[PDB]
Design a protein around this ligand. Sequence first.
Ligand SMILES: [Mg+2]
Ligand SMILES: [Mg+2]
Length: 225
Amino acid sequence: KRKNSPRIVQSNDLTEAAYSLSRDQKRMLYLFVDQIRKSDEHDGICEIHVAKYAEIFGLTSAEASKDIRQALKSFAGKEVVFYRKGYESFPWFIKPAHSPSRGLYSVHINPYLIPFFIGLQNRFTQFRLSETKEITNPYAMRLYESLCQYRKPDGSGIVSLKIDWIIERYQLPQSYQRMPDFRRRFLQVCVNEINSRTPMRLSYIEKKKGRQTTHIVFSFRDITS
DNA sequence: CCTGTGACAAATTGCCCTCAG
DNA sequence: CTGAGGGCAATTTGTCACAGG
Ligand SMILES: [Mg+2]
Ligand SMILES: [Mg+2]
């Protein structure tokens, strides 16, 4: 099969939020949201084990330590903003991470994010973790999550996304407001990298209005077709 | 206006090595 | 032996000048 990798289940509000995290931060953010789904009333305290992280992401003990230490530092000052319109901004962490023993980090998610993570019925995105552990460009990650929000059961879909919305929720660098660059350094990159490192296969077409290009119409099928 | 491309810069990659318990 | 450190060269991301439809 391919069903042994953990099932990531995030609310569509998180899928659509505007924030900025590295690949490495997003890698961890998948793990945290997994822990949180164990509540009979959860508090926002998560733990991270170097040794297991290495096995999941195919990295050496030493380099897995570099990756974790450096991102935990980079969280501070980083906000996530939720919409639906609507406008709300929260901090990811409320305390610095730390290590009570070798190999172990304790992080403290803002408890208020707990409902935005768990979400509402028939209103959520889902994907296996194995589906996304070989992506490098975090932007390629954000797009894949989005596509997954519209995946039918047979692993196929069609969705049109407006470009001014991608620049906003995915918080793209300034210069990609000039379409030639948006084309070259974001769209063609994140599409090839999905085609290569995920079980999804993707094509696209550009919706133009006047001289301006305004929407990307993404459609895809699953490799097991 | 729109487009693509060449050049330059600043950032991320996997990889190497030392050293402490 | 693991993992907390320091470091590096090659490749990928981000910016912007110039040329043409
Ligand atoms: Mg990054
Ligand atoms: Mg790394």
